[PDB]
Design a protein around this nucleic acid. Structure first.
Lengths: 178, 212, 203, 102, 149
RNA sequence: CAGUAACGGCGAGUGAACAGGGAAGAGCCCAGCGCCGAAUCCCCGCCCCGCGGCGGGGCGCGGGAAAUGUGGCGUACGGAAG
RNA sequence: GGCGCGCCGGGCCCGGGUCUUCCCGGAGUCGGGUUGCUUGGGAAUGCAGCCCAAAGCGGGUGGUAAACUCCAUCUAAGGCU
RNA sequence: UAGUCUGGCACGGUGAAGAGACAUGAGAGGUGUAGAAUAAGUGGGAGGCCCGGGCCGCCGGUGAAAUACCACUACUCUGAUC
């Protein structure tokens, strides 16, 4: 089928070399596990009975609301959202609002950043002073790749590739007149 | 009849980065059309009323038995007698000399007729029609009709173009050099169906700026 | 908030994006059975509106219902009546195909309660509706004090007595000058009142 | 003269000093705010136009305006909607012409 | 609870007064009662009622000032009183009320016999009716012909 | 109201509603928009009271649901923050 | 069975008036064309099939089809009682 | 009136060979007496240009606008297409 560029743009996915560098940076700014939360509440009583860190903003609603607000430094999107209407627009939003964005393979991989099964979108709202440089060299090679090719992406129809034996019948007919 | 309307009656503004001028100029408007028949009974005329200081430039004149010999020889009234204008119409076909030395007249008060024989009427089919407003408010009473309503002539280009402003009259006062002009472009608008295509609000020195 | 985007994106149905999506989904839906289960809503945003939460005990069934009108099931197309009732072909069913999809979802899943239904695509011979059903005996629903209205026996088989939204649309009730034939409870209550002779004991 | 308040004519009915308030918050529904204007203009850019909008648009590039109304009307339904639809489509087309030169 | 004063609609009836459904929020507002406290101290509340007139309003504001003066209020814990409550004198003299609270009766003004003015006798009330009828009928095209003129 | 306005080979026939007086009287909640570290929910295993409507408490790096959005605030009578 | 003083267990630690500053909404649904039934509802009261299908200073209603124009009145397509 | 025959709309797509388009970037393009000159022209214009002089001019000379002096839209061939 003749697939439209808004849907098809999710098949231009981030490269293996960059995606490894990206998940190495993303792995330091995890949300806390549900069991990690309680040992933080163990560390309450030493002033009470006797300043919050950067994480990945998870979910689509709570990444969409901080793309429109100019509060996302890089937005990571999964390529394989089951109904695609959930995520179709975030390319357009991030480009228009001037947010650098990349598309990764595996919502299961991006959901293993958080401590759930799947997570469609994952944003970098802030990072720490010593990990500024890694985010800086990511946004360089990602913003040149996606956000600046956007007039190119918007006019690019995917699909429309016939079966290999229908192609091989055409090629036989083509060399039959030569 | 009406093809266009305005609500964002703005966007003249980006002017100083265009115009870096010193000397004598006068900014003019280019405003292109479509669908006019130059062969038919289809007319397009009028004189569109800007009382906010636009500048035509011409061979001057000023008429009238006023207090003219006191007031109107500040910019020099060269008052030739209305009986010494009999030459202008009788030296037309037997003589071959352009006997004007004139391109702009008056319409005076204190006299309530101009000259009701064939010398005042006489200006009906020469162009440069004596029309102007100086009468008995006496605000400027001379330069009102240079600072006047802006004139156009419909010809074999089926286009409208007309002066807007002077190298003077700042950009908050030259936004007001179309304000009582584009409303008369929908008022006295005849059966010249779907006319306007380009509204280029022009600062002469710079870029073609468009306001559609 | 993404749900505002998905709402408006689902309104542009004759776009490039949606005219593709609706076509490949209407393909997919033909290649399953007429009455089967979905593991999540096709349209998460639309179910949000019509009263779905994403907790345990909320079920989504996907029912296909055959398009077209209703022909009078009389043998050899011959009604034994006066020429008024010679109608066979061009008759129409007084309930909608959305309400028919609700009552098949409900009848099959007898132990669940039909909340609402929404259109997820149509065909030439089929319409597809995703119906929200709730398990009334699940403690997630049973211990939540704002969704334990459905755990009373009055809301048994709402789809069949016509209390659902697509059901209600068939009865022709509402306030004002247009709904004067269902004053009181319903169409029958109005008929009963206006035809009941009130013989007072004194007269 | 004296003029009695009468029950028939132009200024009829019982004269009363009427207090004028703010309308209720129900009356302001269906008013375009900046945040929801944003969303419609984004999903215009994502999607595009319907095959009847494009057909009525390429009628208005050729300037068959009456036939553009008649087409939008027979597609959408009634006059007032087709009037508002053409007034919007022509403004989209005039913004394209603002992008044509620059 | 107490029902407000309301005019019957439709010219046949608008010379009468009923009991309304409930007190408008802009009558509670200018009377100084909260819309969620009003219902708990026995005042009917309608959120649908508009106020076109200021006399329809002002009658119903003076209705609530009389009601809030008449009202005896018991302590929420009967042994320890609060500020907005009544005195133990009134609490022991407090009684069940029979019938509709501060009932709505329909009183008309008293016009003393006056001497008829020389103009008052002169006024042509029938001709005024007839020429008010024609001014209402023909006005529309009188404006049209005057526009075309 | 009223066998009325209206329907009807305008034939036979059919046929409501508003206003008015009472009987009764009672009001509300989501989604959405947004902020609160999912602050939310279900279930197993051990202990104690103690429940012929299976509920409260302690305990667990026990298991799951859930960012494809649970709970709190909040809904057209306006709402929220300072 | 029902209720009140109070002993006693648990939780909840919560108000209003005025300005400044943000925000505001249910779509193959309204709507239109046609067809069948229905209605007291008559150039079509309600319901349904099929085709076309929106808007946001919008939309609905204003018992005669339609255009232009003021005015009134509600906030549909989610839910409980 | 069932059925059958026939037309329209919907599911319903993709591609090459063969016209008018217009979105759209161009290049050719014009002959009234009459003037020394194939006037596509308006709001301009005594002036602006390139090595201080020139430059095209001015006047009249044809006519209700006239040749140098920012830029535009149009009409008749031509002409590339995401």
């Amino acid at each position: 089928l003749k697939v439209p560029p808004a849907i098809n743009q999710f098949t231009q996915v981030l490269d293996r070399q960059t995606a490894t560098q990206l998940l190495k940076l993303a792995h330091k700014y995890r949300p806390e596990t549900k069991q990690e939360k309680k040992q933080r509440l163990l560390a309450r009583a030493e002033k009470k009975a006797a300043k919050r860190p950067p994480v990945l903003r998870a979910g689509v609603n709570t990444v969409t609301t901080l793309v429109e607000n100019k509060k996302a430094q890089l937005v990571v999107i999964a390529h394989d959202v089951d109904p695609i209407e959930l995520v179709v627009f975030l390319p357009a939003l991030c480009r228009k609002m001037g947010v650098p964005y990349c598309i990764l393979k595996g919502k299961a991989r991006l959901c293993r950043l958080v401590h759930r099964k799947t997570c469609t979108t994952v944003a970098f709202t802030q990072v720490n002073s010593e990990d500024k440089g890694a985010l800086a060299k990511l946004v360089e090679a990602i913003r040149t790749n996606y956000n600046d090719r956007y007039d190119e992406i918007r006019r690019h129809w995917g699909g429309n590739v016939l079966g290999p034996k229908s192609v091989a019948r055409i090629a036989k007919l083509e060399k039959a007149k030569a | 009849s009406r093809d266009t309307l305005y609500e964002a009656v703005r966007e003249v503004l980006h002017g100083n980065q265009r115009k870096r001028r010193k000397f004598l100029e006068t900014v003019e408007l280019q405003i292109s059309l479509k669908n006019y028949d130059p062969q038919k009974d289809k007319r397009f005329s009028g004189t569109v009323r800007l009382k906010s200081t636009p500048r035509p430039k011409f061979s001057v004149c000023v008429l009238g038995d006023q207090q003219h010999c006191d007031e109107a020889k500040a910019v020099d009234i060269p008052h030739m007698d209305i009986e010494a204008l009999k030459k202008l119409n009788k030296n037309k076909k037997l003589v071959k000399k352009l006997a004007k030395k004139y391109d702009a007249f008056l319409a005076s008060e204190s006299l309530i007729k101009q000259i009701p024989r064939i010398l005042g009427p006489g200006l009906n089919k020469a162009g440069k029609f004596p029309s102007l407003l100086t009468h008995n408010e006496n605000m400027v009473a001379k330069v009102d009709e240079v600072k006047s309503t802006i004139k156009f002539q419909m010809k074999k280009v089926l286009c409208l173009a007309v002066a807007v402003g002077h190298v003077k009259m700042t950009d908050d006062e030259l936004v007001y050099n179309i304000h009582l002009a584009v409303n008369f472009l929908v008022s006295l608008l005849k059966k010249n169906w779907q006319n306007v295509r380009a509204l280029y609000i022009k600062s002469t020195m710079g870029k073609p700026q468009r306001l559609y | 908030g993404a749900y505002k985007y998905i709402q408006e994106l689902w309104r542009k149905k004759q776009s490039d994006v949606m005219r593709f999506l609706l076509r490949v989904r209407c393909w997919q839906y033909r290649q399953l059975s007429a009455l089967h289960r979905a593991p999540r809503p096709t349209r998460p945003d639309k179910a949000r509106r019509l009263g779905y939460k994403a907790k345990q005990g909320y079920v989504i069934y996907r029912i296909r219902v055959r398009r077209g009108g209703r022909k009078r099931p009389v043998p050899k197309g011959a009604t034994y009546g006066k020429p008024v009732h010679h109608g066979v072909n061009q008759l129409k069913f007084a309930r909608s195909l959305q309400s028919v999809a609700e009552e098949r979802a409900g009848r099959h899943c007898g132990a669940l309660r039909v909340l609402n239904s929404y259109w997820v695509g149509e065909d030439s011979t089929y319409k597809f509706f995703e119906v929200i059903l709730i398990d009334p005996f699940h403690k997630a629903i049973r211990r939540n004090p704002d969704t334990q209205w459905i755990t009373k026996p009055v809301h048994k088989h709402r789809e069949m007595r016509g209390l659902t939204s697509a059901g209600r649309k068939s009865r022709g009730l509402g306030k004002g000058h247009k709904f004067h034939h269902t004053i009181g409870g319903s169409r029958r209550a109005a008929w009963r009142r206006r035809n009941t002779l009130q013989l007072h004991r004194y007269r | 003269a004296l003029r009695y308040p009468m029950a028939v004519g132009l200024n009829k009915g019982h004269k009363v000093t009427k207090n004028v308030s703010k309308p209720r918050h129900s009356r302001r529904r269906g008013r375009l705010t900046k945040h929801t204007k944003f969303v419609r203009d984004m999903i215009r850019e994502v999607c595009g136009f319907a095959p009847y909008e494009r057909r009525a648009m390429e009628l208005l590039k050729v300037s068959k305006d009456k036939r553009a109304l008649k087409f939008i009307k027979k597609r959408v339904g009634t006059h007032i909607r087709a009037k508002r639809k053409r007034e919007e489509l022509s403004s989209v087309l005039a913004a394209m012409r603002k992008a044509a030169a620059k | 609870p107490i029902r407000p004063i309301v005019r019957c609609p439709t010219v046949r009836y608008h010379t009468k007064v009923r009991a309304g459904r409930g007190f408008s929020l802009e009558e509670l507002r200018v009377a100084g009662i909260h819309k969620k406290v009003a219902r708990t101290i026995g005042i009917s509340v309608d959120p649908r009622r508009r106020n076109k007139s200021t006399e329809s309003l002002q009658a119903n504001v003076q209705r609530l000032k009389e009601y809030r003066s008449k009202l005896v209020l018991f302590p929420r814990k009967p042994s320890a009183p609060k500020k907005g409550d009544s005195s133990a004198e009134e609490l022991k003299l407090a009684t069940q009320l029979t019938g509709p609270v501060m009932p709505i009766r329909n009183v008309f003004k008293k016009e003393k016999a006056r001497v008829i003015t020389e103009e008052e006798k002169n006024f042509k009330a029938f001709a005024s009716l007839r020429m008010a009828r024609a001014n209402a009928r023909l006005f529309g095209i009188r404006a049209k012909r005057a526009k075309e003129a």
